[PDB]
């Protein structure tokens, strides 16, 4: 998420971050419902309005949406108290954004992006590039446990595969930025270049990495100016558990076969079936069923996207109901101590056990206290010394 | 989502009157209030649409169709072309406005129309003004309005049949701050914010022969045509 | 003081574990002490061989 | 198109209104669809009227007087759910009460009675067959909606005075019968337009947010947009002959000579009801 | 390429897209060619078979009308394993004809070169005794029809009824009072194709015109019909549907069900049952003189109601006792266990018309059913004994579940407050008593009578006070159950997907909706997915209600554990 990353940051970088058209429009584009209204209202103001009038601009109904908005709005340090004038590094550059101060494009963008997603499955046309191979492992979606000729795929790597196309691109860039503090450049110029792409010497090396996932295009082996692609902006399912996907690409076939089993393969159409024994093969690695319905709700046919609610509700709960078979019997381990002749001394052992957070379950019939074995070493020190 | 049509009263008689009145508010400082609110509607969401219609005498061109720097040069070129039967026709532009909303709603959305009226209300179009209101009411299209000099009688009914707002601004050069506060929020955020209430509603009817506004008059019972104080016979049927 | 771990499940599924206690299908003292009709204390070594007994019973009525 | 109407609604209040075969109270399912009936009557007919008479224990008592008040009727039908409804009804006493007021209306209207009738027996102290010669003389139009059977009076009262007699299949047929009684069958009044909030110009009396008549001076107060929806039926727009760049949406009329597309053509005649070029 | 909404698979399977502009002119083509396998709301799936093409060329389309219109609606190109199969199974149709004439059965061929091929099989030489003919025995007509399919020269039963000049053409005329819906007009058009009647099987829902098509087919051939049925109640309906829509006097509509016998010798329409014509014991004297009359008269249009019981051992001997020219079969649930529905393709003929069960719902001919498989958890005292025994005593345990007793009592209360007509179908008749006396509700126990069976059923329809009824295995046919609105099915037979399409027949005769009570984590969970296997192939969607809408708040039975301990001691005492 973007406001998750921008919330936990220093004030000394956000003032540098607010670029001339780039970041001031980008942060303002992601503000929940009402934070866009107050930023617009006091954009042309110069005298700071009183801080108590802001809560009076909202009805008493839907007041809980006010504090979560201004908490995020003051969390990014857009205004301050000052006695609520906006930041002059933000109010000026946002007012610059209000007018102040190629069929080869998309086909290159999709093909250069599937060969990165093909690296997380079995394919002979692997993205042979030593920079990306260490990049995916330090992000935590390619298990190695060995130098190895093949790299494996962890449980988080399967969850990466069934995300949306823009949503899986942001998860990659946040783990590019979190590691670039100690191996690359400053955080300010790399993040302002991405937002300026959406509308120094170290930046060509970052541009040569965006060349490989596919967000720019050179066409003459790193010329002066680049050209951005469509990736740089930021299948029916029926009642009888059968899905008819119209994709002919090999990447979309291996994503469907992760959680279903296939029974025919025509050109330009592949029919599979969501069986019970194949969803249980998916959650065994753990691709849990909320991501399954989210994978089918984004990728859908226009005939699915009709006046009916998409992904009809007898198959969406059934995948949730097939998730709960793994759930029956929960494996939470503990240890036990009992057999006191007195009916009072175990009640004094409650007051020495709740405050650390070790007690798991309480029984008042036979006075059965269960604690975790990681926390069993400290509870016995009170019992032998009274 | 959130298609917003702006209908600006581009009557060259009243703006040219204020251009010689020296009231420090010309047409140029009013289209700037349209262009900034035009640019500000394209910021609150990624997929937001804009349309600007200029109401001239005997004609009415679309301004914006024919990132924001590709929007603002079209508007300043069309206004420089249009401003180069002395009463405005606001009803002919809202009929064009509902056609553009009906086309963009077929290619997919809630929409609204914001009218900035600057001339006096012509009562000669009461038969056609009410038809574009009831067409807007059955498609849940709000008709917001702000006036500059005097309360338009026909335009107050458009904001209460459909469900929009009506605000007479006190000052001309403070228009841009007023637009952002009371019209820049969309339909859902308008319920959460607090806004000025409607101060007066002006319901009248036009006579068929006089086309005059009437508080007490005679209606026919079969053809339902309201007449002024005559009652000699049923003129329509 | 005794060494043993916990398992919590549906009370309908809980009595299946009590059936495996008094039928000697897996071990002898497989449940150390029943604490509740919703929670069960089992021994820590047979926690994995128990899992395919439940997974077969969920697949015996597929 | 249509005419003015002065409809009366006679509601049966007999012992047989406690019967089943309907939503919990046979009386209650009658009063449920009547509240739906008053709304759709006043919507399609702007300046008409409704009286509601309830007959009970060989006598008729007027529940609501004849006035065009689309709020006073529904707020009185909600009160009458807890009615006793004992005894046998009448039909001479109920059509005469609906004749002492409905006769003196002017002759340019369509005076009507609508009887919703569940009992089988009309114990009334005189001859019914002299009313049907009187109601036919006064140009009233009595129509009955019958429940569970067909009575001989309600056929000869309907076909002589001019109305219809109909018997219920079920509740889906009972809503279908009341729906057919809102269309009017094919003068100069003086109403007072109530501008300024809701105040009366003739007597300057301030009252509630209503399309109702004024009690202090007797004037009827209507709202001109409500009258305005009934327009465009008279002089509607003629269709176009159809054989890119448009005039409506900007992306063929025989009057203004401005071309349309297909979405625009269907939109002009369906909802807009005017030609967008002709208003210029 | 974006058009032509099929995908002809190389073995044979036709994936039709039901969102195409030319779907209605490609769904009116695949009914005449293939047979439906699955029909969801988006992509249908038909299937080519051998018997489905014999019904294709029986209608006026030849072998070049099918194999060309597959190319023009292909999306792939026909895969050349279908051009070899369509040509093989269409040029061998009209070569060997089975025609009867005055009480003798004849195998006829116009081409003499196939009779010299046909008369070397050692089983067709057992059934013996231009225009080459040889007379075959009547009692070996079933073992003959297996062999003609076994060597791919199948028999056709096309009655040419327009001019025969032997049968006494009766005055049955369909009166202009019964107008038939546009799916009934399409099924009869595929039957009476070339002006000659055809022996097929028409699958229509029981709430649809399952009987109006049988009457209209009787007024069309206008020969001596013979209606059969599964029960003595089902023939008093067939008698009523002939007087309602066909203008026949009571001196011609007779019966043969051992109680009326309305002079069954010498009539025009005889409405009898199964197991009366195939009663293999010593018959009574009134039935002996009718069967001696019925075994010697050539009928026309035998109407076999409830076709899915014909491939039984005793009900398929009816088709050799009675001599009919054409044999129409009307059913509602064609599925049946033990794999004998493919055996029915030569007892009667090819499957003519199957109604689209979702097209009749979207047009208003069938009530919109909201199926809901509400499953109940098991009680912890009952599951203690469920896993301890295996020999059939646990069938009572997953039937008399106390937590399933609450969901039956709650769903009855929830629909009595909405004035809904409740039917509780419940087999395993010990738990019929213990369910219907703890709620004080009537029950058609099954060995009750003929008397109080008729008045409990009539106190259910024309009375707004008695609202529920507890049937037990009686309503598994086309009985007169009077238009229910919900149906709380509890613990029926094992995997009978014929049953839960006959329990569904009561509901469609949301508007109406039926439940299916399951005791979860038992053997009934595996059963209740075997029985929705037929209904999900028609378009129906079975929801799951794990927890009901506030079950614990009302006054439900079996609250305490003391009253629950007594029920287990009642169940376990049976043994
Ligand atoms: Zn006048
Ligand atoms: Zn008139
Ligand atoms: Zn007054
Ligand atoms: Zn025109
Ligand atoms: Zn157009």
Numbering used by the authors:
A (entry chain C): 18 to 100, 108 to 125, 145 to 242, 255 to 289, 307 to 458
B (entry chain E): 8 to 73, 103 to 120, 128 to 151, 157 to 285
C (entry chain F): 4 to 65
D (entry chain D): 55 to 240, 278 to 334, 343 to 350, 359 to 387
E (entry chain A): 71 to 199, 266 to 645, 655 to 720
Give verbatim lines from the article.
We prepared the core TFIIH-XPA-XPG complex bound to a bifurcated DNA scaffold that mimics one half of a DNA repair bubble. We imaged this complex by cryo-EM and solved the structure at an overall resolution of 3.6 Å (“Methods,” Supplementary Figs. 2 and 3). The cryo-EM density was of high quality and revealed DNA and all protein components except XPG, which likely dissociated during cryo-EM grid preparation. XPB binds DNA in the duplex region, whereas XPD binds the single-stranded 3′-DNA extension, consistent with translocase and helicase function, respectively. XPD and its associated subunit p44 move by ~80 Å, and this requires a flexible connection between subunits p44 and p34 and rearrangements in subunit p52. XPA forms an elongated arch over DNA that bridges between the two ATPases. XPA binds XPB and XPD with its extended helix and its intercalating hairpin, respectively. However, in our structure DNA is held in a positively charged DNA duplex tunnel that is formed between the extended helix of XPA and the XPB ATPase. The tip of the XPA hairpin contains a conserved tryptophan residue (Trp175) that stacks against the base of the DNA 3′-extension at the junction. The plug would clash with DNA in the XPD pore but is displaced and mobile in our structure.
Genomes are constantly threatened by DNA damage, but cells can remove a large variety of DNA lesions by nucleotide excision repair (NER). The NER machinery is built around the multisubunit transcription factor IIH (TFIIH), which opens the DNA repair bubble, scans for the lesion, and coordinates excision of the damaged DNA single-strand fragment. The purified TFIIH core comprised seven subunits including the ATPases XPB and XPD, whereas the kinase module contained CDK7, cyclin H, and MAT1. Here we prepare recombinant human TFIIH and show that XPB and XPD are stimulated by the additional NER factors XPA and XPG, respectively.
